[model samples]
Target chain A: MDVEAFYKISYGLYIVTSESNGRKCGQIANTVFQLTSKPVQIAVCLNKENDTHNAVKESGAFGVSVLELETPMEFIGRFGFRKSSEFEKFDGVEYKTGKTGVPLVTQHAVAVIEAKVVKECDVGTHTLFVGEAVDAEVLKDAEVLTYADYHLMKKGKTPRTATVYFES
Target chain B: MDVEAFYKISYGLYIVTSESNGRKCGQIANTVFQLTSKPVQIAVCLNKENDTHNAVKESGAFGVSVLELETPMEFIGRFGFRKSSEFEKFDGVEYKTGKTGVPLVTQHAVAVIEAKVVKECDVGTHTLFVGEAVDAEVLKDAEVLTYADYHLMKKGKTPRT
Candidate 1:
């Protein structure tokens, strides 16, 4: 298959946050989605081996901040390329704790969604956390960055943790 | 925590089709999305427990047909509610096999996409299937049904299988 060509599909980048034992942690993700409407549910996929996975499991809650086009590669790499356990990913970032006590990125974000975990399924290397959205608010009325734009315009590279990442 | 207020998010519903052992099969899905544009990669989340998952794994290929608002509930139930292994869901449906032998819903589709699986990640109950779209065609020039439109206008219900 033509792997390079597949990179053109449009996707929106986002920062997923969760609380772990009173600590703030987050990771870059592009797989956030609304699963249902009645009672309002959303789903986020996290690598099972990642600290964010353990955090969401322990806290039973998480937050998603949609990133905008103006977001810099360094900002994305801060969370996207590094492990939250090793780095204070949110150390110098502009963010605030949400209702769930999850860190919500305010810088270069278009909106924020807070969700409460209702169901979880363990799939080999990753876990799908299905949650009921508890709260939502627009951070800014800006153009949301599509995953395609992240690479095309920013010339970014997908990391190993990314769902679509593959060896060259 | 007002859950009702959070339902305004946008989404879309799609019919994912595939073939295994020369037989045509398809399943209703709301998790289809465009992943990239350069080589035209798209992602689709499939419940690992579903029969469609087996077919896709067997053929390593699949097709996607965008649904329209005019699609009847009975049609939705045919693919969404009924299991193809137990019943011939496409017996009365008009369809044609594509390059991968996967069936394409010719009767009511706004567009058709044929893709070959390039990468997949097992994400809990669902497996995110990322495929490189090799061919696509506009079946009908109509308004494709978004997930929000299906819920608000069609009042459709989705039972996770």
Candidate 2:
């Protein structure tokens, strides 16, 4: 069983954000995908251990910022490699509170989608949050960043909490 | 609400196949994603109107073929555009029956995963099937095809079921 075969699956990089008890949290995610078109439903899988998971659970809403290909590694490191419980992810970050009260990241974002959780599934190590898009906007004209680009061009590494993280 | 914003969410092209009763079926999909790493679970959302949807529901198993960038348009059209109810999708296709009796397409696949249904969710127009991979194998070293590549380079049109 060559586990590397799973790498063939494609995904886009995103920053999924939510708030809980007046505190905001966000994390870099790559497992988000559209589920339906009529209602504009999408699903994102987050590690159960991430603080953003609890925030989304309490607030019932979340914001997704589609990162552009030129997004700096420093920005991705802040949200992906650090824990929201210890570090303030939104601190010194350019963002605005969406109608859902979630932070919509503006920097290096080509598009943003605010969604309300419609369903939740506990799939072992991660929680699959299915959401319906409540609001969406195109921020800039830029090429979106893909996981393949991150790997081949940026030489990126997956964080432990990521869905595609495989133990070496 | 720019609907085009949704297109930025990247995805890979796949051929999800399964057997229903004594017949085999497959369809092109772009919504497959890994759900968990511990038990190695993945999910694929299929339009409810698709024949592959009922076939997966009845068989409780399915195969996923990660399509490579070199996959011919003809091969993708056979599984993606044509309905298996009226057409024989696997007629000339090179495939093998998986342990779950699902057809694992090998012609243009870079990787193949055989999964057994662990959970199912009806999400309005589509059914999200969460499957635990029972078997997987790497076929070749080739660049996988992304839905973006299909649209930008191949100029492919999404088939309406």
Candidate 3:
């Protein structure tokens, strides 16, 4: 396998926030998509080791903040390059408690979707969290960020825990 | 749920091909993604009613042709807007039989990944086919076609079928 062939696969960027036992955390993700149209179902894949992964399991909910394309790398780095365990990712961030009671980072996001996870699947190193949308609201009108844009335009680096993470 | 929120979700466009009992078919899709790394597993979600959906089931293998950004609307329409049941989408299309014996549309694609189905899941109207990539080859250097660019740059319409 050339492996570079995998790089051509596309994705969008978002900050997945979760809360459990009164503790909250957020992390950057790219593997979210809608599974079914009606009864609106969505799924997000996260590495098993991520802090937010455990939180989503315990809380049974998550908030997807669809980042805008123009979001600065510094903003992405807070939830991406750093760990939510050691660092408070939601500190001083402009956000709201979503319908599912998770933080929705609205400052740099174009939309916020709150979901109540109804199903989970273990796919090796990552877990696919399928949820039913409890509420979805438009944050602002802007072009959303794609993972390709993060690589080409922003020149961002993949987090060590990202599902698509590959080391050269 | 505000359905517009779902619109913010992103995807990549590709032509997924499969073969079964000497019958072959292909369809446009956006839900293909890498599920695991060590074994090189990939998953593609397709509408259960799509012709290629059943082919992948009977054949137990499929091919993914990652489309480039410059692929024209006409070429996409051939496989996306029309059904392979009524039209031979690959009749004159430049393609090659991949490692798994499936057609890989090489003309407008940046790379082709061949796989054998290892697992499957039913996610409502779509069936998620998980496969371990058997062969991955690069065809050329180019930017990929994201679903967003397909709408904004190409000024395309989503097929009702």
The DockQ-based CAPRI class assigned to model 3 is acceptable
Candidate 1 structure quality by residue, lDDT tens digits, A34-121: 6545556677878776778899999999998888767888888888755454345776788887777888778888788888898775
Please provide, for model 2 over B44-149, each residue's C-alpha lDDT reduced to its tens digit, 9 standing for 90 to 100: 9999999999999999999999998767778989999988888999888899989888999998999999999999988899999999989899998876778886
Provide the lDDT at A148 for model 2: 70
Ranking by TM-score: 2, 3, 1
Please report the candidate that would top lDDT against the real structure.
2
Q: Which stretches of candidate 1 lie over 4 Å from their true place?
A: A1-9, A84-87, A156-168, B1-15, B18-30, B33-62, B65-95, B98-102, B105-161
Identify the leading candidate in terms of DockQ.
2
Q: What TM-score would candidate 1 get against the native?
A: 0.59
For model 3 chain B, give the 10-residue run with minimal summed lDDT. Answer: B152-161
Give the alpha-carbon lDDT of every model: 0.71, 0.87, 0.84
> For residues A1-168, what per-residue lDDT tens digits would candidate 2 score against the true structure?
668878888899999999999988899999999999999998989888888999998999999999998888888888986545534566688889988999899889999999999999878788899999999999999989887777765655653124221121
Cα displacement (Å) at residue A106, model 2 = 1.3
Question: What ranking of all candidate models by DockQ puts the best one first?
Answer: 2, 3, 1
Q: Model 1 scores what on Cα lDDT?
A: 0.71
Residue B140 C-alpha lDDT in model 3: 90
| Comparing 1 and 3 on TM-score, the stronger one | 3
